Design a protein around this ligand. Sequence first.
Ligand SMILES: O=c1cnn([C@@H]2O[C@H](COP(=O)(O)O)[C@@H](O)[C@H]2O)c(=O)[nH]1
Ligand SMILES: O=c1cnn([C@@H]2O[C@H](COP(=O)(O)O)[C@@H](O)[C@H]2O)c(=O)[nH]1
Lengths: 211, 212
Amino acid sequence: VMNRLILAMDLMNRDDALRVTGEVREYIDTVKIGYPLVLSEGMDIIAEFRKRFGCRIIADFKVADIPETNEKICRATFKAGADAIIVHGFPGADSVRACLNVAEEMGREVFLLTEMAHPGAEMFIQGAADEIARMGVDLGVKNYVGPSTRPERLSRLREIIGQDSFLISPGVGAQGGDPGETLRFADAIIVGRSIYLADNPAAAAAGIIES
Amino acid sequence: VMNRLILAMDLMNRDDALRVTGEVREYIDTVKIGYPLVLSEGMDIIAEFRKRFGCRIIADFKVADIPETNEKICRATFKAGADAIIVHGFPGADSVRACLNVAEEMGREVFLLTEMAHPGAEMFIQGAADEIARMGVDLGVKNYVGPSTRPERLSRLREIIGQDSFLISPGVGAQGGDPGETLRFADAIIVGRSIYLADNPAAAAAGIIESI
Ligand SMILES: O=c1cnn([C@@H]2O[C@H](COP(=O)(O)O)[C@@H](O)[C@H]2O)c(=O)[nH]1
Ligand SMILES: O=c1cnn([C@@H]2O[C@H](COP(=O)(O)O)[C@@H](O)[C@H]2O)c(=O)[nH]1
């Protein structure tokens, strides 16, 4: 990923989202689009971004349903042009396999979310995280998401998945995570608010890269 | 809910979804719309269904993000006209609280998903389910979702949330759950494929209602 930095574009109106993404395009070539923007502006926004900025798009949909529904969600998402989709591992192996099957059929990728970065993640997710990561390895998952806010957990996750797996990590900046420390374990960092709420998003992105 | 039956409308094209929903409207007045339909036809489909069929709409979005993002998802969903939203409890109390705060601000409801009905739910969700339900009670959640496929777990869930809470349950029909047994514990059952993939959805819905 360009500069090992992925922009989390969670603004909810198309004009602001287009403005910020265009301003930071010289620093990042991969954008993570989630439900805040998609449910506000429509799925067509994925193809619009891919074309206008020539960036890879990761759909952060935290897929977390039964197998049959997960398949439908993944198919609609890849039809919309997403290059990859983020899926929760807490619902179990069959739910993750359903996403992997659709990605295989459509020539796309699945990122498995193992542990989340917010405080509430300590209640139930953290205790299941190592097992969720091992499940991913057993299913053949090669792309993972882990927390910038807990580098000791990111280290443990990297250990389970190996150095060959691709690991991206949110929670940098606004949630307290540090870019440099996170990149000791993750291949790329995800940054949203620290860039998109900045008075000068380009300067904020440039600063992160400088750091 | 009318006849204690909620239709899970997971068809992915507007014309088919409109046809089936209209055919079974005399049997059910509450429709659950999820991402399969919304990501295929747009969020405007929620208001269209609400108006066209005069039914309550539950947005089954299995919200499962950090607090800040959950707030945005809930706000966009209620702006689109949904009467309620289904949220996962596994990400923790702060994430659930964020959804409850937006529902309070907008005069809407949050349904907390405690245990899922599919086989994979046994891996991680089941072992956390009782605690997730208790967390819901502690947060003031009054609406819950539990599995038709495991009535013993549904009974345990009803036990934690009390008789005053509203409990709806998917997994009836296609996934193996039984309407009658599920209604021993849930206030309403959710049915998707058994109705929408039937050669005659109205007859399928009518049969379910007669079996209970
Ligand atoms: O454990 C996780 C998984 N995903 N995200 C997501 O990554 C982005 C982080 O944004 P932020 O830089 O503004 O905090 C948001 O889209 C958020 O939903 C997290 O924050 N934590
Ligand atoms: O634990 C859960 C939670 N939600 N659903 C959802 O309820 C519906 C059940 O549909 P079905 O009757 O066709 O199996 C689908 O929309 C599905 O995503 C389940 O099946 N199980």
